[PDB]
Amino acid sequence: KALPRLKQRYREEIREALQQEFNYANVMQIPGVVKVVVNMGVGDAARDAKLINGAINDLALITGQKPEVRRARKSIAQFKLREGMPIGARVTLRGDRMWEFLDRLISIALPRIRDFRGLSPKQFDGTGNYTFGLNEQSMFHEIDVDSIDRPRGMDITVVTTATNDAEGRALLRALGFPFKEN
């Protein structure tokens, strides 16, 4: 009896739109969205570890799930990094949580980018995956404007069942992403 709006807008007509656009052999061929992954690559926590607390708090407040701390898998002095210290936080969004989250992204956070000129269509993987980084965290209304001690951006990765760039871009355009044209 509960159904998120983006899930509905997908199910009712993106199915038929993509089917008539690409003439698939059958229904299961139609590309869909699997998961969206949000992480803060802190890195600079090597000097001081308390940056991770702010990072995880921001991820929790923007995603509704607490993140997990990603430790260093190698030791590198050039960055002054040893085995296993808090370096980043990840959040994996699946299901209706992912659906309403990226609805919120596509409708609220992105318009609040300062001088939003668009997202490059050429940001895709070549296997149907879209990833884009972000320079600031103040766009989400769910962070108080006085909560920012310092700026901390994110990487957002969207994983789809698209075979490659064509259908990946088509699905994301149909979803309402603000792409450019060049």
Partner 1 sequence: MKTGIHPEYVDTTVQCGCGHSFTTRSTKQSGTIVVEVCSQCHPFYTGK
Instruction: Determine, following the binding rule CB under 8 A, whether residue 117 of this chain makes contact with partner 1.
Output: yes
Token pair 């059958």: residue = 26
Q: Considering the complex, what minimum distance in angstroms separates the CB of residue 51 from partner 1?
A: 19
Q: Considering the complex, what minimum distance in angstroms separates the CB of residue 41 from RNA?
A: 3
| Residue 8, binding choice from partner 1, Mg ion, RNA, none, Cβ under 5 to 8 Å by partner class | none
Q: Considering the complex, what minimum distance in angstroms separates the CB of residue 161 from RNA?
A: 10
Give the angle subtended at the CA of 124 by the CAs of 166 and 96, to the nearest 5°. 90
Among 110, 134, 143, 170, binds RNA (CB under 7 A): 134
Residue 67 buriedness (CB in 10 A; 0-12 / 13-18 / 19+) = buried
Break positions in the chain: residue before each gap, C to N over 2.5 angstroms: none
**How far apart, in whole angstroms, are the C-alpha atoms of residue 137 and residue 163?**
31
Amino acid (one-letter) located at 66:
K
Token pair 């600031």: residue = 136
Piece of the chain touching partner 1 by CB under 8 A; list 42-50, 58-66, 69-77, 157-165:
58-66
| Residue 120, binding choice from partner 1, RNA, Mg ion, none, Cβ under 5 to 8 Å by partner class | RNA
* Cβ atoms within 10 Å, residue 140: 16
Measured from the CB atom, the residue of 2 and 77 that comes closer to partner 1 is: 2
Among 128, 130, 156, 171, binds Mg ion (CB under 5 A): 128
Note whether 42 and 86 are within 8 A (CB). Answer: yes
Among 20, 26, 78, 182, binds RNA (CB under 7 A): 78
**How far apart, in whole angstroms, are the C-alpha atoms of residue 47 and residue 82?**
12
Among 14, 30, 33, 124, binds RNA (CB under 7 A): 124
Instruction: Determine, following the binding rule CB under 5 A, whether residue 31 of this chain makes contact with Mg ion.
Output: no
Q: What is the contact surface with Mg ion in residues (CB under 5 A)?
A: 128-129, 160
